[PDB]
Amino acid sequence: SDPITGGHYENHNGYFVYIDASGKQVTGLQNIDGNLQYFDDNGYQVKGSFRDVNGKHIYFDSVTGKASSNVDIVNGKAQGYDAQGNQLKKSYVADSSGQTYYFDGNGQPLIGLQTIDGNLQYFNQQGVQIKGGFQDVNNKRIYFAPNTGNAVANTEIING
Amino acid sequence: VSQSNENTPHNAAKSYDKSSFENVDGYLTADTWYRPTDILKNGDTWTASTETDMRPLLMTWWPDKQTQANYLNFMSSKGLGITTTYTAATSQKTLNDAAFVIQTAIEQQISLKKSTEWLRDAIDSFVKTQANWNKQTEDEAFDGLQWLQGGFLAYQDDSHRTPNTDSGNNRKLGRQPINIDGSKDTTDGKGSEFLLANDIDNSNPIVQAEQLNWLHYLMNFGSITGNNDNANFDGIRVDAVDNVDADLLKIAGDYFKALYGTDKSDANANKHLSILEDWNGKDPQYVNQQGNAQLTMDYTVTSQFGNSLTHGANNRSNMWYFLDTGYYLNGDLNKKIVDKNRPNSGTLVNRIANSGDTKVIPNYSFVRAHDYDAQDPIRKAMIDHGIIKNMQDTFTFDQLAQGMEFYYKDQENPSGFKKYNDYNLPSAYAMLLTNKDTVPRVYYGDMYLEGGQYMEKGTIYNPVISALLKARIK
Amino acid sequence: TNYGGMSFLDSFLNNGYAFTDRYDLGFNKADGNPNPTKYGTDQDLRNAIEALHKNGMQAIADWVPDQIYALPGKEVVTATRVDERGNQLKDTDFVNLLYVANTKSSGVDYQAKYGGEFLDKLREEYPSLFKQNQVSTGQPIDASTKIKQWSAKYMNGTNILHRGAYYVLKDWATNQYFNIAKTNEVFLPLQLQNKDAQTGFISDASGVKYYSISGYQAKDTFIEDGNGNWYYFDKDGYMVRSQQGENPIRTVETSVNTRNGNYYFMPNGVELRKGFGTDNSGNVYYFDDQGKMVRDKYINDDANNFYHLNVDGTMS
Numbered sequence: 001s002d003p004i005t006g007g008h009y010e011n012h013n014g015y016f017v018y019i020d021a022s023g024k025q026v027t028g029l030q031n032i033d034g035n036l037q038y039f040d041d042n043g044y045q046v047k048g049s050f051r052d053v054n055g056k057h058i059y060f061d062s063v064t065g066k067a068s069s070n071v072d073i074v075n076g077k078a079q080g081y082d083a084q085g086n087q088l089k090k091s092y093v094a095d096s097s098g099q100t101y102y103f104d105g106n107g108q109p110l111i112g113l114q115t116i117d118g119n120l121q122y123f124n125q126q127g128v129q130i131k132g133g134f135q136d137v138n139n140k141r142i143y144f145a146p147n148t149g150n151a152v153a154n155t156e157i158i159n160g
Numbered sequence: 161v162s163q164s165n166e167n168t169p170h171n172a173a174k175s176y177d178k179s180s181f182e183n184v185d186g187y188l189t190a191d192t193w194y195r196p197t198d199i200l201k202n203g204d205t206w207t208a209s210t211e212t213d214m215r216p217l218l219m220t221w222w223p224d225k226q227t228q229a230n231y232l233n234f235m236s237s238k239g240l241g242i243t244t245t246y247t248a249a250t251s252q253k254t255l256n257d258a259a260f261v262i263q264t265a266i267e268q269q270i271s272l273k274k275s276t277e278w279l280r281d282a283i284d285s286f287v288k289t290q291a292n293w294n295k296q297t298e299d300e301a302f303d304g305l306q307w308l309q310g311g312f313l314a315y316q317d318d319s320h321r322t323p324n325t326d327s328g329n330n331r332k333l334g335r336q337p338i339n340i341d342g343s344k345d346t347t348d349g350k351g352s353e354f355l356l357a358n359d360i361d362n363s364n365p366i367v368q369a370e371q372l373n374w375l376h377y378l379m380n381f382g383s384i385t386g387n388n389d390n391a392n393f394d395g396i397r398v399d400a401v402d403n404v405d406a407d408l409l410k411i412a413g414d415y416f417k418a419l420y421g422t423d424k425s426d427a428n429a430n431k432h433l434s435i436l437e438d439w440n441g442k443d444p445q446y447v448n449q450q451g452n453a454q455l456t457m458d459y460t461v462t463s464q465f466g467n468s469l470t471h472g473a474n475n476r477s478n479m480w481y482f483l484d485t486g487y488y489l490n491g492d493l494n495k496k497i498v499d500k501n502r503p504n505s506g507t508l509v510n511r512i513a514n515s516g517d518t519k520v521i522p523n524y525s526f527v528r529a530h531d532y533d534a535q536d537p538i539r540k541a542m543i544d545h546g547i548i549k550n551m552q553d554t555f556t557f558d559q560l561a562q563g564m565e566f567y568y569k570d571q572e573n574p575s576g577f578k579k580y581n582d583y584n585l586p587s588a589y590a591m592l593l594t595n596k597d598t599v600p601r602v603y604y605g606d607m608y609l610e611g612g613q614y615m616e617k618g619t620i621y622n623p624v625i626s627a628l629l630k631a632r633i634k
Numbered sequence: 635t636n637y638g639g640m641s642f643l644d645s646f647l648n649n650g651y652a653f654t655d656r657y658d659l660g661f662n663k664a665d666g667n668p669n670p671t672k673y674g675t676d677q678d679l680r681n682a683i684e685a686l687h688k689n690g691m692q693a694i695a696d697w698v699p700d701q702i703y704a705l706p707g708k709e710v711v712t713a714t715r716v717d718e719r720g721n722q723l724k725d726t727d728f729v730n731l732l733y734v735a736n737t738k739s740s741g742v743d744y745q746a747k748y749g750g751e752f753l754d755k756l757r758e759e760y761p762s763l764f765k766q767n768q769v770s771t772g773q774p775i776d777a778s779t780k781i782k783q784w785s786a787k788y789m790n791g792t793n794i795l796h797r798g799a800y801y802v803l804k805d806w807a808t809n810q811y812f813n814i815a816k817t818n819e820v821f822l823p824l825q826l827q828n829k830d831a832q833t834g835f836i837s838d839a840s841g842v843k844y845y846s847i848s849g850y851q852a853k854d855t856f857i858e859d860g861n862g863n864w865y866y867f868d869k870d871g872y873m874v875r876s877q878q879g880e881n882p883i884r885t886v887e888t889s890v891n892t893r894n895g896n897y898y899f900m901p902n903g904v905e906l907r908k909g910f911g912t913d914n915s916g917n918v919y920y921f922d923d924q925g926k927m928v929r930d931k932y933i934n935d936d937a938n939n940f941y942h943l944n945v946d947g948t949m950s
């Protein structure tokens with residue numbers, strides 16, 4: 001969506017509206033000053049929710065209302081999405097809560113032990129990436145790193 | 161909202177019984193097909209159904225909107241519709257309308273193909289997609305023996321819903337030798353009753369009788385199947401002792417006593433040599449309290465071979481551990497006073513100075529087995545060379561043959577280093593075959609190569625072991 | 635052969651530890667053609683055994699009473715998910731559910747021919763074997779019934795078959811399973827009987843009611859709407875909802891036992907999940923992924939915040 005400028009933001013009943021330089025209230029997907037945003041039919045802005053525009057499933061941020069990546073549970077299953085609303089294939093995505101999935105070639109999240117980009121990582125039964133903890137896989141205990149989630153050597157206190 | 165409309169009486173069941181519904185014990189399944197009253201043949205004209213005109217229940221009914229929406233989306237993707245996205249949030253009316261346009265398209269491809277097998281496969285595929293109809297709702301796990309097959313279900317005695325399946329209150333689980341009376345049911349001493357496949361209820365007296373029938377059939381196999389009294393088995397190995405009801409040991413013991421007088425003499429007993437696969441460390445003492453009707457294994461010696469010779473390129477327990485000096489009081493090899501108050505920790509048979517004066521538990525012993533130091537190494541080798549990914553992975557015989565070539569190459573490595581295979585097998589056999597108070601057992605795979613054709617090629621160890629064996633006689 | 639679940643190497647390597655017919659040791663096909671095991675025909679076996687006796691050696695039979703594989707006939711069992719010792723898994727909803735297992739033998743195999751045949755002869759010749767009590771059961775073995783065909787009633791269980799917890803079809807509203815065995819006690823969705831199935835949420839003066847796709851009213855059951863929200867409908871058929879000035883926490887005891895526990899229902903009936911809820915008196919509780927109150931443990935947060943829940947449920 002082509003950008004616009006010179007229209008102020010107004011708050012009505014707890015919601016952000018945007019009124020054009022023309023002076024008309026704005027609906028639908030809009031790039032305002034380099035930020036991609038959405039307004040429903042009443043002209044209120046959407047934040048922290050997913051909307052469907054054209055063939056795209058686009059999440060908008062909870063603070064700014066700006067289009068960015070998320071994971072949506074679609075029907076029974078998780079599916080990742082980018083800033084432009086395209087289903088992601090062979091990519092990591094972090095959801096709103098800071099949890100991480102990796103979606104394979106078919107866009108379906110990987111589960112269990114996986115080797116990605118030469119890195120060993122683990123995923124729980126719901127597809128979420130284990131980070132900063134031990135995990136018993138294939139009759140062995142492995143620690144996965146705090147931010148990368150990569151397998152590394154670690155020590156724990158067993159008994160004393 | 162009301163769902164009934166002009167198609168309802170047509171798609172309704174012809175009959176409310178087993179004729180018109182594919183079922184199991186009366187119940188229905190996700191992949192049930194049924195007989196509708198009428199059929200929208202070719203998507204044109206409704207015509208009465210004939211007994212063979214069966215249709216999938218999921219063409220017409222769904223357990224919930226989520227499933228309905230998934231069905232619609234799935235069938236759409238297979239050419240039946242412009243690919244669609246529906247959600248459980250979609251109105252019921254819209255989903256039902258969309259189901260009908262799919263039904264129409266289905267009847268058209270049935271006319272076009274003159275077959276319904278294509279649909280059977282489409283439904284089967286779709287059904288496995290749904291979590292309630294696949295393993296995701298089964299809690300697959302791999303710890304313990306669940307490692308083998310992914311987890312177990314225990315059947316229950318439920319006369320109201322599933323009365324054919326009732327056990328008549330006879331499903332006692334984990335009655336291994338140490339827990340034969342259930343007195344350790346609340347601890348880890350309860351036996352792991354579940355191992356593989358369909359676990360037979362050997363706590364049921366009717367099933368116990370049947371196991372004896374089978375036992376009789378084996379011990380008289382030649383008489384029964386070839387009227388050849390020389391083609392009969394002489395003794396038995398009891399597989400998976402700790403995973404069944406320990407009554408089976410007594411049943412087998414008493415049978416041999418009755419028919420062969422094994423309790424009469426050593427000549428009778430030793431004419432029908434019988435062994436147990438009894439891994440629990442407290443089985444030897446149980447077996448001996450029950451009169452040694454079958455020979456216990458002696459893991460204590462097999463274990464020490466692992467630690468001191470057979471396992472690991474370097475850090476190995478000393479040969480000193482083979483002695484078990486604690487057997488004597490203060491470990492005094494000069495004074496040799498047996499410690500009556502020993503902590504029950506030690507090797508089964510002391511051999512420091514065995515003159516045959518003290519009674520000891522009869523046993524068999526081994527270095528390797530078909531199921532010890534074989535199945536894991538052979539698979540580790542296949543995994544290590546990218547032939548399979550997991551130990552539980554399915555492999556083909558060609559996959560096995562290729563792996564075997566690496567296994568053999570490692571076994572016979574002139575460097576002397578072994579990655580999958582066991583070290584010092586000759587030296588191990590030398591000890592196994594000279595030990596007093598044991599019946600030694602020899603593994604085919606230490607004499608011949610474990611893969612390929614039976615006895616196709618001897619191992620490098622064959623000559624030494626063969627010599628040891630002949631020397632044992634002399 | 636694999637009717638569901640993970641195949642094991644014994645089976646696909648034909649080593650003989652995984653078998654369908656316990657009495658078939660290499661017999662010919664019924665058409666007359668040879669049908670060896672991996673080790674050869676039954677004649678080859680009798681010849682091998684005889685040869686060992688001619689050379690003064692004994693032959694050991696592998697007796698494998700623990701299990702049997704790949705039974706071709708289906709039955710509906712009642713099943714609970716368990717570990718190797720038959721103890722229920724700690725955090726499982728799979729408890730006393732109906733499941734289709736493969737437990738029934740063909741009834742026309744060598745188990746049918748030779749099953750129980752030799753027992754009568756044996757009881758006559760050695761009565762005491764059949765009169766001696768076994769320890770685990772207190773009972774003697776029972777040859778009054780012969781097993782020509784295996785079926786679930788003689789089994790403790792099975793490896794999971796990957797079929798699902800609800801492959802056997804059930805109505806969510808009443809929790810009754812569909813059945814057509816006897817015309818006196820049929821239960822089907824109303825569409826299939828050409829009756830009118832109404833479905834959805836409907837308000838009345840007393841409260842909110844729900845009708846499933848099969849046209850039945852929800853009573854004493856949890857129900858999920860199309861947007862993912864969960865509700866509980868009480869015995870009377872009404873959605874539970876919190877009132878003003880009253881405790882939103884409610885204790886639920888359902889037909890489905892695994893779901894028993896304390897829940898937090900909001901004024902519009904939505905069950906709180908994975909979050910904290912305050913009661914009328916200012917006490918805070920936490921409620922898990924599935925809506926249940928959590929008690930007597932520490933609990934962690936995505937931002938690394940830690941909380942403690944007392945035994946009575948409250949948060950210290």
Ligand SMILES: OC[C@H]1O[C@H](OC[C@H]2O[C@H](O)[C@H](O)[C@@H](O)[C@@H]2O)[C@H](O)[C@@H](O)[C@@H]1O
Binds near residue numbers: 121
């Ligand atoms: O390639 C870098 C990284 O991508 C993902 O992690 C992203 C992100 O995950 C969280 O929000 C952590 O808290 C941040 O520190 C991370 O940058 C993959 O999960 C990870 O495996 C990979 O290394």
Ligand SMILES: OC[C@H]1O[C@H](OC[C@H]2O[C@H](O)[C@H](O)[C@@H](O)[C@@H]2O)[C@H](O)[C@@H](O)[C@@H]1O
Binds near residue numbers: 459461467481484
């Ligand atoms: O398993 C028979 C074994 O039992 C005792 O030793 C157990 C174990 O002691 C240490 O952990 C060593 O590291 C191992 O090599 C030993 O197996 C008896 O002391 C020993 O004599 C016997 O072989």
